[PDB]
Design a protein that fits this description.
The complex is a heterodimer of chains A (about 170) and B (about 35).
Chain A lengths: L2 E11 L9 E9 H8 L13 E6 L15 E7 L7 H13 L9 E8 L4 E7 L5 H15 L8 E4 H4 L7 E2 L1
Chain B lengths: L6 H6 L24
The chains are: A alpha+beta (about 170), B mainly alpha (about 35).
Subcellular location (chain B): Cytoplasm, P-body; Cytoplasm; Nucleus
Subunit structure (chain B): Interacts (via YXXXXLphi motif) with eIF4E1. Interacts with DDX6/me31B.
Organism (chain B): Drosophila melanogaster (Fruit fly)
Chain lengths: ~170, ~35
């Protein structure tokens, strides 16, 4: 097997009637082979039920801002149309490959990623540890823009977690 | 050390023997994310 730099944990959120126990820790992996073994046997985002999330975070980091790893952080947000024109599945995978492949110079600043399946739109977000660290967020954000081929008219928006829990304010845009 | 995999390197291993049994962790949890 080919080892990964970090150990990653896949989470799956599904709406049920629970409050914060709606988040399910599926499994963890630390090799490329085991990643695919997991990815090959789960539904792609496009087939996921409305209101559900996939989240991939480093080991011992919960997919919530309250976590000690996310408390001072923020996220690069990608908003997407519901239409089939959007390459939602391949875009989510490329985000995952960026993560586990450690495509970022500030690897220690990466916490994870989340894909939200909502009614009006879908959101893919990359979570980083320190919002104040401009050099970190930007380096990561630029790696994303150049890797994801978002285009001219599409923008990456960085949002502090504190601003989310209040039409969310962004502090960086790419 | 620093283990960096390109998108190509990662995709190249997508259809290995171990990449194709199924995942290990399968707790008694019934959720719709599992493929069929």
């Amino acid at each position: 097997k080919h080892p990964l730099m970090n150990v990653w944990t896949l989470w799956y959120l599904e709406n049920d009637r629970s409050w914060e126990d709606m988040q399910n820790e599926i499994t963890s992996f630390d090799t490329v082979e085991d990643f695919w073994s997991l990815y090959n046997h789960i539904k792609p985002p496009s087939e996921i039920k409305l209101g559900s999330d996939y989240s991939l975070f480093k080991k011992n980091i919960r997919p919530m801002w309250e976590d000690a790893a996310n408390k001072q952080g923020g996220r690069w947000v990608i908003t997407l149309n519901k239409s089939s024109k959007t390459d939602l599945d391949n875009l989510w995978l490329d985000v995952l490959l960026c993560l586990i492949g450690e495509a970022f110079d500030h690897s220690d600043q990466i916490c994870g990623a989340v894909i939200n399946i909502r009614g009006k739109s879908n959101k893919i977000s990359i979570w980083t540890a320190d919002g104040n660290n401009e050099e970190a967020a930007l380096e990561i954000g630029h790696k994303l823009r150049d890797a994801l081929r978002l285009g001219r008219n599409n923008s990456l928006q960085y949002q502090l977690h504190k601003d989310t829990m209040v039409n969310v304010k962004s502090i960086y845009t790419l | 050390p620093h283990m960096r995999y390109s998108k190509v390197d990662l995709l190249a291993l997508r259809y290995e023997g171990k990449s194709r049994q199924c995942s290990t962790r399968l707790e008694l949890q019934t959720l719709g994310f599992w493929k069929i």
